[PDB]
């Protein structure tokens, strides 16, 4: 019932250093047994680039609890067992700054309508299908152009290295934070019209999930 | 960013037309004895846009009117003629110090009275402000 | 003549213990012999798991009477003999529970338009078709985005699983009640726009087909 | 949940406002003696709107309008610096303590009259109901 | 946040004689050790025509420091070492003149889109792409006609040859100055209608990338 | 900055006696060493039938000086050696009368779009395209339907013939004069409508270029 | 009814030592009689290297219960007598390891074809067949190309060796579990083309015969 | 998981001096005694050219280390001493020179089919094969046509005298290092077709094995 007006957009510039977890325990509010707490400490985001838990992979989430040996993540279910098999080893990083992008024009998305079987069978005379695979997602963002900006470097140099970058999302109404990862594409031919501002096209694809936190719970 | 904007139009046009007869909003002001012509000067506010979705980078737009008032029986020739100096002085793009020109060198229909003529010259100024 | 105003949408959450029956006869409301009654009660949806007729399988049915040793089942017809041949034997479980969807903005529905085959013959001059099979039925819902609602965790469940799942709809000016089961899709991908509150997508597929009853049967 | 969205405009109000003169709607009211201006106060009432199929979850819908009046021939600038402390004042997004606004910071046209001119400021609120 | 409002194209009308370049070292703004300055100057544009360096290629730069054996060119980046190896060779030549084209109606571009692989594996459910290639840029200009304007006989000269010229754009709000070279295409057939001005049209494709430079650089 | 208002469009009706030029020297103003003047005379217009240089082949043109053995012709240049080698023959004939197409209501053109090739090359990663050829011209015409038109006849039997025809244009905002020579397409079914003159269609294609020459020129 | 989606592909790598089981009697779960226990355990997969009985030759097989002189397995029906003559005696390996094969784009399998022997009587006048044996069964698995993975020189050594190795694949949705075995063929030529994964193909033989048991049984 | 996208494709134009080692041991990373030093150095690719050991005939190399007696290679791995008899003696060349084949379009490969050996016995009733030697490999390549490049006399040459010549590609995505040898046939008839790009064919043979280094360790 919540206004998605006011929400804000920050991308990823420099992660850390890697940090390998021996094991964790699968419940509400998983558990690793860090072998060193390094720099972790309140209210961290981290992002995974490595696991043997194949579903739980570049996932961005956010520590919750910070000990010597024990560190505690909040933002995915680790209730089941099957899917969730004792004894995977888990490895992560830590995101160092955040940069937020300029004013954003306009936010769109495409893909993710999902795709279906249809089979017929001699016996019977109605056709049913069942679900099936999720097409992929891209997101698209509109933003005012700006020469001299600082981040058009950090843009490019991601979209030259290709490598999978966090992004984040704050909407004030819904006190909620999103939070995703993927590879970043840029844009930077000004789309020149009359009595109106010129603007650049910024979209972002997706390797994984996305995670939904209270925003009292990051600070 | 709005009282900023008509203060530089105000600059402007005093930084013009400073020893010419003209009239201001809200000020006392009697016409010429000798019944020679007079400036007019008004102020006329428009909307301001929101054009992100985090509402935080805005626009303003205004109008300005100036006016020409000439005495009846006197003919449209030099009217007409102050009215071209008047456009041509507020060319389309000129960078005020506050803001811009959107819109300039506009002459409308002349409007008429029993005691005096009109001939009104608008333009429109615009500014932009980002929030932080 | 009615006015579809004021509907509201049902889904199952909590099935129960499996029931069998040992044969069941044909006729408008159709009698079952059952070894026991167990925990079945006046007004109790159930639903049929399995059985030998094929037109009369995963279809809702709303009890009528109870009985130590029958059970008395509304909403399907038994009155031909062909198409229900004496002797089928019937197993169906109850539903325990219901939850409710939050205000729904949207609904739509897309599929079962009959197809026609076209055949032209030498002899004659006028080309004629006949019905065919019809499409495939998917219903879409559309509602409000709540992070922290309590039926998100059931829905991804529900589409994990890929079990087959009830849903009831309530007409208060029609005093109608839908009935229906199919398999379960959610999207969890709010639709953020300006100046409009961001939705999110539930599809349901069909397995069955719809059963009316009066509203007064129910209760 | 209409009466309470008005009740929370007016605490907010004078919680700024408290002790300049200000008029209340049907309320008798004198201008002050000294000429000086004052501050005008409106409700306009907006339209419900039922956003879902079962006429459950609603939405209010609401305008308040603040106007400052101020003497003839005394100028437009004290005038506009006001209305831009009362636009700053009543930000995008302000949550107030029964709704929240949905679109603020207005500035209109002046209205002229004879014996005193006004700048009316304008925005509006909206507030989310679910009816169980 | 600015407006496109008031902006100017100009083309190239003829360059100069071909100047060599030894060797030049990658920094923030390179430094090439010519044989002889010759007729450079401070603030004059050029035009590689040839180099080892394949992505710097067809790029209009220009000038900042002009000596006897050194000259300074900004508008590239070569901080990077792996993709800009030491020791490539350099070859450019110098714009004389520029010339204007006349009131311009409308301007408007097509493609760049950026296009995507989908992969769809066993393993795994849901569907997930990579980023590709992008697509062409084609540039369109249109103008009003006049039969015997000047840079009609320069333009066709251009379309028969085949070479490439450079452009330039200037946009005084922003202060900027774009720079870009393609073949030129030239379209003389009026387009006749009933009260309004006819037109031709001009298209210009992409050979290299686009320069943003700032305007009071260039003087 | 013209505007095409009060545009009148002539149609050659009958040709003269075919001329042979020896030889045409190639400059700004072309001269041919015509065995004899002839009928032609100041400001009459002329067309080639065949000769050597492809280029100009069915090529409107118009005179400028008369001699008993020179002859000059304006509207084409020939400064180019490579293109117009020297030596090539030339033959034309003489237009004798033109005739007017009564007002015409709408004018149209279509083709003329510039095709392109692309080619992707594994050594790089983005995408280039060259120009390639142009697409057909052919211009439609639309007027007043008339059954007893003199015209009529003379359209029908040029269209049934099949020769190539030459065509007048005049823009008198313009001070201009095109000219072109095309095959001639009538149709001759009104298009019949409620409260509107039905009209009459005529197309014709295009064998040569354009020609764009002074109005004062003429006469 | 179930989606092959989501199904994984194992091979293993080392086998154990062989156990020699002294007899064993058939019918619907065979026992064996073991000289010791050995390091077998509940829940092994189990291969045969040779046995008297040429039809259970290279078969794989599922341990049911542990004992220290008998063994039971599952995944073979020995209720006839007559093809399954007593006083057998069975000669089997142990696995010890299991690896992945990594992201596979498509599967596929060839043969199967069952050819007929066609004979013609005088006697008779309807032409008339009678099956034979079947083909040979080839499969063919291409999967993603990364060298960094470790199992392309247990590939090489397996194509190399020619020793007979088995395939693990289990799928997800009906819960069933595959068993085959056959001689590795791995191809190490990558297929190249510009815009699309590039991935190497896998070729496999058969030596016996499908064998199909339940993955609740296994683990 | 990399996309073959970037890669460029290299060719040698001459050979140094032969040199020979006088014994080479076997194990994870050979290392040769050499007389001489000789003008080797650091990531300097090796051919060799005859040797006793038959499986690394016409293999390319990299040097890992350089010493005045002994050389260290990569790429092929010789733990295996069944298939590796010790007592052996290298003789190796020397590249010098490498050259750039221009713009390529496409490219492909043929071969790699590995045909299986049928055989039918009476005693059993399926029919069995077994894997056999493997088919030759064929690489085509067709690269962009411009007799300006002064690489076409080398590849006359190089097919003239029928030597043994390498092919060096580099993958700047997966940072692998691909080396290959075989026969040059170069073809130098242009195909040529309207509006389309004219190119020529390439085809090479194969001596051994791929061989597959880290482009890291080249350099």
Chains 1, 3, 5, 6, 7, 8 share one sequence.
């Not at chain 1, 919750?64 to 099957?82: K, N, P, R, V, Y």
């Not at chain 1, 016996?123 to 933003?143: G, H, R, V």
């Not at chain 2, 071209?84 to 409007?111: P, R, S, T």
């Amino acid at each position: 019932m919540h206004l998605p007006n006011g929400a804000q957009i920050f991308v990823e510039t420099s992660r850390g250093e890697e940090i390998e977890a021996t094991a964790v325990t699968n419940e509400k509010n998983p558990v690793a047994t860090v072998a060193s707490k390094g720099d972790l400490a309140k209210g961290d985001y981290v992002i995974v680039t490595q696991s043997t838990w194949a579903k739980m992979v570049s996932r961005v989430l956010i520590v919750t609890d910070a000990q010597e040996t024990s560190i505690t993540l909040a933002g995915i279910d680790t209730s089941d067992t099957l899917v969730f098999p004792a004894g995977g080893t888990m490895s992560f990083a830590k995101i160092t700054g955040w940069t937020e992008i300029p004013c954003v024009q306009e936010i769109g998305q495409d893909g993710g309508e999902q795709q279906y079987y249809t089979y017929q069978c001699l016996s019977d005379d109605k056709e049913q299908q069942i679900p099936t695979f999720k097409s992929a997602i891209s997101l698209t963002y509109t933003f005012a152009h700006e020469f001299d900006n600082p981040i058009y470097q950090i843009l490019r140099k991601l979209d030259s290295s290709g490598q999978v970058t966090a992004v984040r999302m704050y909407v004030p109404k819904a006190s909620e934070m999103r939070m995703w990862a993927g590879i970043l594409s840029f844009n930077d031919i000004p789309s020149t019209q009359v009595n109106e501002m010129e603007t650049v096209e910024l979209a972002v694809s997706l390797k994984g999930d996305f995670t939904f936190i209270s925003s009292t719970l990051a600070s | 960013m709005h009282y900023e904007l008509s203060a530089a139009a105000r600059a402007a046009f005093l930084s013009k037309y400073r020893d010419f007869p003209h009239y201001m909003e809200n000020r006392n002001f009697t016409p010429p004895k000798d019944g020679g012509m007079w400036l007019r000067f008004n102020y006329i506010e428009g909307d301001t846009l929101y054009l992100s979705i985090d509402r935080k980078c805005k626009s303003y737009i205004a109008i300005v009117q100036i006016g020409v008032v000439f005495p009846p029986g006197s003919g449209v020739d030099e009217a007409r003629l102050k009215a071209k100096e008047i456009a041509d002085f507020f060319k389309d793009g000129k960078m005020l110090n506050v803001g811009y020109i959107f819109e300039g060198a506009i002459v409308h229909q002349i409007v008429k009275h029993e005691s005096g003529w009109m001939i009104p010259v608008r333009f429109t100024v615009r500014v932009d402000t980002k929030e932080t």
